[PDB]
C-alpha cells in the first residue's frame, strides 16, 4: 500500500473528528489542538 | 471503505512540563483524524518531543535495532518546521521511501533555538540504504542546506 502526498492530502479536510477510542489524559492535554472536533 | 496503511503507526509524546504512547492508527482516515487534533510543532511546548513510529517499534532502549541505528536530522528555525514535519509523516506512512523497510519512525524536537526533525533507521552500516533515504528525504522536503546523519 503506497500513497502519494497529493493523494493523502485529498482526505485531510474530510476527517476533523478525533477517533472515539482516543483517550485524552491529563498528562497529554498539552498535545491536543487548541480546537478539537 | 477506509484506506489501510501498509503499517500501523503509533504517536508518542514526551511532555516537558517519560515517552508515552498516544494512539496507534492504521488508515489514512485515522491518520488525519488524529493529526488534525494534535498541535503542529509550531504550537508545541519547548523541549517537547513528538514521535511517530511503526507499531511495535518503541523509540526507546527496548528496541536496539532502531535505538542503536542511524539517524537523519534536519534543523528548522523555531516554529518553521510544520510543513517539514507533515511531509515527513506523509512520506513515511505513504511508503514513499525506496528503502522504507529501514525506516523506524520520525520525531520532531521543539527546542528554544530550532525545531529538529529526525528519521531513525535500521542498519546504519548499509551505506547505500542510508544514502537513498537521506537523498529521498531531501527531495520530499526540498531543503537547501543541512541534512545530517548520525551513527552510534
Curated annotation (Swiss-Prot), chain B:
> What cellular component terms from Gene Ontology apply here?
cytoplasm; eukaryotic translation initiation factor 4F complex; nucleus
Note down the stretches annotated as region EIF4G-binding: 3-6, 13-39, 87-96
Task: Give the UniProt keywords, A-Z.
Answer: Cytoplasm, Disulfide bond, Host-virus interaction, Initiation factor, Nucleus, Plant defense, Protein biosynthesis, RNA-binding, Translation regulation
Cystine pairs: 66-104
Q: Where in the cell is it found?
A: Nucleus; Cytoplasm
Residues annotated for mRNA binding in this entry = 43, 61-62, 111-116
Post-translational modification, as annotated: According to the redox status, the Cys-133-Cys-171 disulfide bridge may have a role in regulating protein function by affecting its ability to bind capped mRNA.
- Offer an example of a GO molecular function term for this protein: RNA binding
Protein role = Component of the protein complex eIF4F, which is involved in the recognition of the mRNA cap, ATP-dependent unwinding of 5'-terminal secondary structure and recruitment of mRNA to the ribosome. Recognizes and binds the 7-methylguanosine-containing mRNA cap during an early step in the initiation of protein synthesis and facilitates ribosome binding by inducing the unwinding of the mRNAs secondary structures. Key component of recessive resistance to potyviruses and Tombusviridae genus Carmovirus such as melon necrotic spot virus (MNSV). (Microbial infection) Susceptibility host factor required for viral infection by recruiting viral RNAs, including uncapped and non-polyadenylated RNA, to the host ribosomal complex via an interaction with viral genome-linked protein (VPg).
**Note from the entry:** Displayed sequence is cv. WMR-29 and cv. Vedrantais.
Q: What family is it from?
A: Belongs to the eukaryotic initiation factor 4E family.
- Identify this protein by name: Eukaryotic translation initiation factor 4E-1
Source organism lineage? Answer: Eukaryota, Viridiplantae, Streptophyta, Embryophyta, Tracheophyta
Q: Report where the shown chain sits in the full-length sequence: first residue, last residue, total length.
A: 58 to 219 of 235
Amino acid at each position: 500500500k503506497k500513497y502519494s502526498r497529493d493523494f493523502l492530502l485529498k482526505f485531510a479536510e474530510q476527517f476533523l473528528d478525533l477517533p472515539h477510542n482516543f483517550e485524552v489524559t491529563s498528562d497529554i492535554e498539552s498535545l491536543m489542538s487548541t480546537h478539537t472536533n | 471503505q477506509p484506506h489501510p496503511l501498509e503499517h500501523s503507526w503509533t504517536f508518542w509524546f514526551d511532555n516537558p512540563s517519560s515517552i508515552r504512547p498516544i494512539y496507534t492508527f492504521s488508515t489514512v482516515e485515522e491518520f488525519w483524524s488524529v493529526y488534525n487534533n494534535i498541535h503542529h510543532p509550531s504550537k508545541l511546548a519547548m523541549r517537547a518531543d513528538l514521535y511517530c513510529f511503526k507499531h511495535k517499534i518503541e523509540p526507546k532502549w527496548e528496541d536496539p535495532v532502531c535505538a542503536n541505528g542511524g539517524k537523519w536530522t534536519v534543523n528548522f528555525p523555531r516554529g518553521k518546521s510544520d510543513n517539514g514535519w507533515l511531509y515527513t509523516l506523509l512520506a513515511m506512512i505513504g511508503e514513499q521511501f525506496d528503502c522504507g523497510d529501514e525506516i523506524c519512525g520520525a520525531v520532531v524536537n521543539v527546542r528554544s533555538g530550532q525545531d529538529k526533525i529526525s528519521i531513525w533507521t535500521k542498519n546504519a552500516s548499509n551505506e547505500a540504504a542510508q544514502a537513498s533515504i537521506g537523498k529521498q528525504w531531501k527531495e520530499f522536503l526540498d531543503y537547501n542546506e543541512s541534512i545530517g546523519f548520525i551513527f552510534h
